């Protein structure tokens, strides 16, 4: 037997597993507890560290997926099923994974910590696309991933109460970061160069940790992929959070028979309801029909987030911080088949002029009629105001800019001008195995497979140029984790990647072609969302 | 005893003069009185037809210019002085001029009636650039131009009173049009094919004759160069017209401090003041400092204009009408040196960001701060937000589109979509003799010298290809006056000039190169001024 798979951490001992990759073996430790299971009376409560265990915990397989909604829009379709849970759902789900090279590094190694996304209602570290055996084997780095509570189990907030304080799903991530500081050295990891990187709701969560003092001291670099904490979907006010939690309780029968309005009795009822009863009513508490809007998201409670994320970025000092931000080519196209009128993944979605006018009401919810008119003008080609193919591509840009691209460009612009060294990219490659239709372009979440070196898997049908492109993207992400710069540093033939400056606004395009530097992260479109639109609704 | 230079009309007898052109001789009749001199008691009143005269009226030289402000911004400068009066000022100015070919055409010939511009405060038919000896000799047409009262003498309005009804300057043009009907046949003209073309405020007057039923029966085709009746500067309501008229009186000493407020005794005072006293206080009645805004302009009284010009365009039927509209490449550049901050004729006019923000409030007067912010959002290059050269061209486009280009696009779109045949052009050539600086480009009013064949003058130093370019535009303009279609009737080799329609939006570019068809008359920019900005002002 091998002795590399037996590790002693502060809790106890673990037995790992040796996984095969085309280029070598990797040591994996899957299912490591970092918190007591938040079930029964611990539901909705902040996590507490795992009690030390006697004996050896079997860390040779993925643990359970946190309880969450399961996508049933297109059953049996690879594009949607690839993000659904691949393990049993359970409230017992606070387990983390560690990947380390073989043989174990003798010298301390940088640590990458992956925080998956999923609109704060879904996601798991067990997904095959999030497998980090190829990233660890190729770049010889320590990769850590964890499960955090999602949906109502992680973000239901009755603000001002001890039983449902909210943001407990983000506190799961912080506790998993504290576990890295205390235990990553046992796997050959360097706790003095931790690099947080997430995507979608995970990229927003990484931004939430930058704005929180207790979480700031647990990492040193950040990568945000298609997400930011200042997005319109990432947070919610305490008033709305109280209303959404109250309606969800009323939907499940709480409080019983017009009982007293204490928050103590309300949460007491929600702890007795089966886990699936809460999940079956997650989407019924949304205020209106919309896309890219979620029921239970992080709340500005004053504890974790002192102020709104928009305010904390404006007054924050970010010296000694390296940030890598980016977006895919067509961010908003993925969310249109989830409720926007006239859109289907099985045809071409050649929407009419009237459907485009209604898609803005769903894509940009809770805005005045005049505010919707400004959005219509800015995205309507008035030479062809009724071209179906142009209206379809235009509505994709409306959802993409409003939710992902423009909140990211403002974050990168404010980070660079306040001490941080920011690098920006734009993912422009469409994988040859993409099951989604052609008009979707480069949809949300489909750069993750290339970052995690999935094309290196022999069973997958990626092409030869995509495999080389996968190693190059891993090099960029790993180089940023070690030295804080995506460059080699010396190649010296590869075009350099210039940092994103608030004035020049430089970024690169990532595809099969070499690095091409561009200027402006959709400056003309985002100037409307970040500058003019706030004044439009502020002046009633 | 030359029979060609003696003509008997309804009023009496006229002796003309034979003028020289490099091609051939032309018979000109300059100074025909078509109305009684509006002096003394006839000041501010509609014109009366000229009494028949016993004898022979001398029509061998241009008559006096209507009293008007004289530009003293850049004295002794060819650019501004070429638009200043070349004859002595007098209220006795209602005279017209007729150019006819030599020998006189034995068959009826189409007539081209020319209306000068000048912001309704200046202008004259005696100007050298308005000489129609080359257009008549080369294309064998009949050119007629008149003098209409400008400034307060032609547009001061006290609505509700019979002493100062307003729009009297417009009636001077209609009376000259009735003179054409009764007398143009004596010069060889065809009152059945009368084409009415103007420029700037003259093009605005042409469009206002289209919306006046009595003036509708005096012409059959219309051309509007860099002007529209629906522009924000072309009309003023009755309420503001009474304010500007009464405020102008208070400056000249009327009413006699202090008589009653009835208009009868107020106009009685304004008729006693010398004409120059009325001109010296013309600009002192403007409510706000602004460019491309003029004191006394046509008023919506109900007699001449039943409703606002925009409302009349939306409801009128224009079947059987052929219209030629167009703008120059750089409309707003001429007006920037007339008050906009940081702009000078003698330097590069590299304005700062603060000067740009201040110039928008001058170019777009009397709009909300939120409305001004919307204007800054459109015309700012947010990738280079402080570039002085780009900010200069930006402010030149704001004034150009808001006042000229977009009001023309609204007319041409609603004319074609309601039965009228519309052709559109964009003049892009900058004359080699242009005394204005280079950053102005192709300024306002500098296509007129090419339409009138002035480059064919041997005393002027126009280039060889510019002379040929002048003969092209005269052919385009003459063919439209004869056939109703600009492109040559029998020439399949010359590129075709397609009609402008609401959906296609097709125009041509006029320069040294052959016709090049384009799509969209500033469609993206004009969508903001025509569609969105009205809604932004409705909710204040
Ligand atoms: C049809 C009815 C269903 N009903 C209930 C109405 C329904 C259900 C869900 C939604 C919102 C769906 C999203 O907003 C996608 C959110 C999302 C974000 C990221 C990810 N990755 C994990 C990153 C993978 C991205 C591909 C996945 C999903 C609308 C309606
Ligand atoms: C320094 C003070 C001057 N003050 C009194 C303040 C002053 C005076 C005049 C103006 C308005 C000037 C214009 O809006 C140009 C109007 C115009 C338009 C067209 C033409 N063409 C005849 C077509 C020729 C164009 C080239 C001529 C003039 C503002 C301020």
Swiss-Prot record, chains A, B:
It is an enzyme of class 3 (hydrolase). It is a peripheral membrane protein. It holds the Pfam family AChE_tetra. One of its GO terms (molecular function) is cholinesterase activity. The active site is at 200 (acyl-ester intermediate), 331 (charge relay system), 444 (charge relay system). One of its GO terms (cellular component) is plasma membrane. Huperzine A binds at residues 83, 130, 334. Interacts with PRIMA1. The interaction with PRIMA1 is required to anchor it to the basal lamina of cells and organize into tetramers. Isoform H generates GPI-anchored dimers; disulfide linked. Isoform T generates multiple structures, ranging from monomers and dimers to collagen-tailed and hydrophobic-tailed forms, in which catalytic tetramers are associated with anchoring proteins that attach them to the basal lamina or to cell membranes. PANTHER family: ACETYLCHOLINESTERASE. This is Acetylcholinesterase. The lineage of its organism: Eukaryota, Metazoa, Chordata, Craniata, Vertebrata. The gene is ACHE.
């Amino acid at each position: 037997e091998d002795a590399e798979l037996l590790v002693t951490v502060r809790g106890g001992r673990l037995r790992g597993i040796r996984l095969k990759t085309p280029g070598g073996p990797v040591s994996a430790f899957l299912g490591i507890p970092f918190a007591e299971p938040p079930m029964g009376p611990r539901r909705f409560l902040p996590p507490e560290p795992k009690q030390p265990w006697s004996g050896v915990v079997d860390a040779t397989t993925f643990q359970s997926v946190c309880y969450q909604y399961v996508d049933t829009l297109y059953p049996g379709f690879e594009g949607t099923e690839m993000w659904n849970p691949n393990r049993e759902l359970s409230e017992d789900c606070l387990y983390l994974n560690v990947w380390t090279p073989y043989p174990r590094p003798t010298s301390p190694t940088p640590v990458l910590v992956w925080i998956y996304g999923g609109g704060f209602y879904s996601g798991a570290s067990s997904l095959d696309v999030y497998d980090g055996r190829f990233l660890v084997q190729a770049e010889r780095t320590v990769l850590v991933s964890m499960n955090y509570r999602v949906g109502a189990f992680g973000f239901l907030a009755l603000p001002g109460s001890r039983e449902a304080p909210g943001n407990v799903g983000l506190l799961d991530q912080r506790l998993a970061l504290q576990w890295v500081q205390e235990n990553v050295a046992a796997f050959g990891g360097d706790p003095t160069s931790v690099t947080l990187f997430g995507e979608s709701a995970g990229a927003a969560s990484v931004g939430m940790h930058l704005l929180s003092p207790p979480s700031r001291g647990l990492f040193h670099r950040a990568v945000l992929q298609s997400g930011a904490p200042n997005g319109p979907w990432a947070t919610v006010g305490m008033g709305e959070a109280r209303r959404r939690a109250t309606q969800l309780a009323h939907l499940v029968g709480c409080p019983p028979g017009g009982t007293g309005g204490n928050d103590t009795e309300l949460v007491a009822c929600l702890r007795t309801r089966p886990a699936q009863v809460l999940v079956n009513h997650e989407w019924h508490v949304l205020p209106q029909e919309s896309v890219f809007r979620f029921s239970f998201v992080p709340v500005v409670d004053g504890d974790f987030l002192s102020d709104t994320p928009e305010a904390l970025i404006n007054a924050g000092d970010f010296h000694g911080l390296q940030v890598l931000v980016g977006v895919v080519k067509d961010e908003g196209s993925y969310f249109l088949v989830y409720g926007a009128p006239g859109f289907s993944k099985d045809n071409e979605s050649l929407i009419s002029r009237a459907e485009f006018l209604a898609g803005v009401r769903v894509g940009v919810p809770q805005v005045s009629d005049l505010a919707a008119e400004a959005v219509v003008l800015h995205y309507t080609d008035w030479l062809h105001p009724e071209d179906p193919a142009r209206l379809r591509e235009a509505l994709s840009d409306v959802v993409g800019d409003h939710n992902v691209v423009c909140p990211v460009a403002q974050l990168a612009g404010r980070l660079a001008a306040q001490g941080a060294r920011v690098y920006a990219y734009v993912f422009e490659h469409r994988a040859s195995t993409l099951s989604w239709p052609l008009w979707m372009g480069v949809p949300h979440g489909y750069e993750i497979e290339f970052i995690f070196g999935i094309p290196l898997d022999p069973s997958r049908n990626y092409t030869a140029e995509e495999k080389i492109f996968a190693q190059r993207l891993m090099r960029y992400w790993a180089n940023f984790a070690r030295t804080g710069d995506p460059n080699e540093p010396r190649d010296p033939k590869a075009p350099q990647w210039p940092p994103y400056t608030a004035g020049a606004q430089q970024y690169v395009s990532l595809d099969l072609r070499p690095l091409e530097v561009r200027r402006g992260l959709r400056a003309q479109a985002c100037a409307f969302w970040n500058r003019f639109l706030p004044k439009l609704l502020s002046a009633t």
